[PDB]
Amino acid sequence: PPGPPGPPGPPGPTGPPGPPGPPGP
Amino acid sequence: GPPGPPGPPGPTGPPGPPGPPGPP
Amino acid sequence: GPPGPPGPPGPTGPPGPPGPPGP
């Protein structure tokens, strides 16, 4: 019969940049 | 026997980097 | 039966945090 599932895949891609910050004081 | 199935997807990747500075 | 291969990549991470406030 089939062997067991493989292990987990790698961590996915890093997310995209954050939004720009707020207006300077 | 034949191979097992592929495994599950991995974990969610790290968060992205900080955005740029805001307006002046 | 030998193990299956590794899983596919996981999902893309969330957006980062906001930038700092400008000048």
Question: How would you write chain B as a 3-class SS string?
Answer: CCCCCCCCCCCCCCCCCCCCCCCC
Query: Quick one: tokens of B2?
Result: 């034949």
How close is the nearest chain A Cα to the Cα of B9, in Å?
5
**Tell me, what DSSP letter sits at residue A19?**
P
How close is the nearest chain B Cα to the Cα of C6, in Å?
5
A3, A12, A22 ranked by CB distance to C10: nearest: A12
**Helices (runs of H) and strands (runs of E) counted in chain A:** 0, 0
Residues B22, C21: Cα–Cα separation, whole Å = 5
Note whether C20 contacts B24, CB cutoff 8 Å: no
B23 and A19 in contact (C-beta within 8 Å)? no
Hunting for tokens 């900080």 — which residue is that?
B18
SS3 letters across chain C: CCCCCCCCCCCCCCCCCCCCCCC
Residues B21, C23: Cα–Cα separation, whole Å = 8
B12 and A12 in contact (C-beta within 8 Å)? yes
Residues A21, A19: Cα–Cα separation, whole Å = 6
Q: Which chains touch A (3 or more CB pairs under 8 A)?
A: B, C
